[PDB]
Amino acid sequence: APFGNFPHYSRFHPPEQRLRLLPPELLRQLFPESPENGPILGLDVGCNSGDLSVALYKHFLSLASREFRLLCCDIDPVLVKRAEKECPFPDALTFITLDFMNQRTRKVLLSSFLSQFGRSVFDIGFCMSITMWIHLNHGDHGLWEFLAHLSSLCHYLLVEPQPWKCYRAAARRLRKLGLHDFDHFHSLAIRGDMPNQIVQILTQDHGMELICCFGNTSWDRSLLLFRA
């Protein structure tokens, strides 16, 4: 699993103590309630086995005027269709297999999904614990391009950057497991304060402003909310 496609990542830190400081009223606190805008469209990048996506859907409190549709994508197809067969809400969550660092696949599938509601772009994006894997697999330039695509693809963006602590463990686990091919740990110049580095990249470069954060940047894991 070089892209970090660990089966059932949910055994690793539980959904509940990654959203305990996340307000359930977030969907109420971010979007108007006029139904003319249509459903609230979320893009969950990196839905390992649907656990955290289902938990995010069950966690947010609805508006009772619009409905929350969530397109979740992942690079491992077996994991995606497991998430499909394990998923409580069929008519609310749509699972697809996508390598987000592929222009053609991403453009085609994301326009196929958003054509169903008009929706030139998404409403809210979810980038939970995928930053480090995009980084390790495509260098600083791939992290930059990933954040750029998500900034120009979403109105709001809830990123969970993995700290530099996890980088060492992941790089060791990949180097020893005959997979140092999917690892640029040496050539990474963006380092140390991954939350603040993501903040600076999404702020100076991609026209987004940090409007919320739940957790400390020096904590276990911090959640960071940007808006275009």
Q: Closest approach of Cβ 45 to ligand SAH, in Å?
A: 6
Q: Closest approach of Cβ 5 to ligand SAH, in Å?
A: 4
Distances (CA, A) of 135 to 28, 146, 155, 173, 177: 32, 9, 23, 15, 18
With 0-12 / 13-18 / 19 or more C-beta atoms within 10 angstroms meaning exposed / middle / buried, residue 189 is exposed
Q: Closest approach of Cβ 228 to ligand SAH, in Å?
A: 21
Q: 185: Cβ–Cβ under 8 A, 6 or more apart, which residues?
A: 136, 167, 171
Instruction: Tell me whether residue 37 is annotated as binding.
Output: no
Instruction: Tell me whether residue 66 is annotated as binding.
Output: no
Q: Closest approach of Cβ 35 to ligand SAH, in Å?
A: 30
Instruction: Tell me whether residue 220 is annotated as binding.
Output: no
Instruction: Tell me whether residue 5 is annotated as binding.
Output: no
Instruction: Tell me whether residue 48 is annotated as binding.
Output: yes
Distances (CA, A) of 46 to 31, 36, 97, 125: 23, 30, 9, 11
CA distance 50 to 223: 19
Choice between 74 and 183, CB closer to ligand SAH: 74
Give residues in contact with ligand SAH (CB under 6 A).
3-5, 9, 45-46, 48, 52, 73-76, 98-101, 128-130, 133
With 0-12 / 13-18 / 19 or more C-beta atoms within 10 angstroms meaning exposed / middle / buried, residue 196 is middle
Binding site feature residues for S-adenosyl-L-methionine = 18, 48, 74, 99-100, 128
